[PDB]
Amino acid sequence: SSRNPNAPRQGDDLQYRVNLTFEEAIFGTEKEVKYHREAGCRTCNGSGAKPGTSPVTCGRCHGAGVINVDTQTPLGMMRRQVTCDVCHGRGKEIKYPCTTCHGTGHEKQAHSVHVKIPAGVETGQQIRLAGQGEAGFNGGPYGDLYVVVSVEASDKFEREGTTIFYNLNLNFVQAALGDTVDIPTVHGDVELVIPEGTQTGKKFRLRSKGAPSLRGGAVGDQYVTVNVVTPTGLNDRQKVALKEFAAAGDL
Ligand SMILES: [Zn+2]
Ligand SMILES: [Zn+2]
Numbered sequence: 001s002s003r004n005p006n007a008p009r010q011g012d013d014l015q016y017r018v019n020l021t022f023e024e025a026i027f028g029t030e031k032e033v034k035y036h037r038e039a040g041c042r043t044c045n046g047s048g049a050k051p052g053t054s055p056v057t058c059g060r061c062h063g064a065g066v067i068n069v070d071t072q073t074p075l076g077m078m079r080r081q082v083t084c085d086v087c088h089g090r091g092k093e094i095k096y097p098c099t100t101c102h103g104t105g106h107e108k109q110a111h112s113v114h115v116k117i118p119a120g121v122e123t124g125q126q127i128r129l130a131g132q133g134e135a136g137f138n139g140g141p142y143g144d145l146y147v148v149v150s151v152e153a154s155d156k157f158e159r160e161g162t163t164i165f166y167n168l169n170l171n172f173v174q175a176a177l178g179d180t181v182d183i184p185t186v187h188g189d190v191e192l193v194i195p196e197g198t199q200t201g202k203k204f205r206l207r208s209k210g211a212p213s214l215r216g217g218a219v220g221d222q223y224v225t226v227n228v229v230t231p232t233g234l235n236d237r238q239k240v241a242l243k244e245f246a247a248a249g250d251l
């Protein structure tokens with residue numbers, strides 16, 4: 001959005017997709033990220049000239065970057081500026097460019113970054129790290145680095161925001177008579193008491209066993225949801241107990 005062709009301009013942004021485990025995301029964590037950015041030659045100090053040589057005033061534009069283009073009218077003179085045949089900038093140290101960056105002041109560096117992942121992130125949350133990402137032009141600023149969280153599934157839990165979700169399979173006997181089960185939690189295990197008579201679908205709410213909130217909130221909750229499993233692959237002693245169960249209870 002500026003007419004000066006050699007105006008300063010910010011470098012390209014970068015994106016890193018970082019893979020987390022279910023729990024890494026629930027809690028905090030930290031990673032070092034290794035990658036190759038374009039950074040700006042340390043070998044030439046940013047000007048693409050063999051050290052001990054120098055950019056020099058242009059052998060056409062005479063230090064202007066532009067060629068005045070003057071045309072005689074009846075009433076006067078027309079001046080058109082067109083950007084220089086050669087330098088397109090200011091100087092012209094092209095006879096001796098830096099060896100590594102082939103003249104443009106930008107070296108492929110190897111870079112590493114220390115990232116605090118705050119507790120509670122979900123897949124697709126981004127973090128902006130200001131300095132990182134690619135080199136600016138004509139002395140402009142450095143790009144930003146953007147990491148997107150990508151969270152791996154759990155074998156036990158589903159999640160959504162602060163809330164954790166666990167399904168409990170109960171058998172008929174446990175459902176009818178009640179029972180006490182150990183319930184997995186991202187914070188460790190928790191004993192839960194199942195009343196006698198539990199209907200399938202029942203939702204139990206464990207307070208503050210869910211995920212920490214990004215926006216300063218208190219920890220969320222883990223909701224346990226009961227599923228009653230019909231039994232299958234039943235031997236004859238088992239089918240007798242049930243037929244005998246049926247009879248006891250229509251008497
Ligand atoms: Zn260089
Ligand atoms: Zn020139």
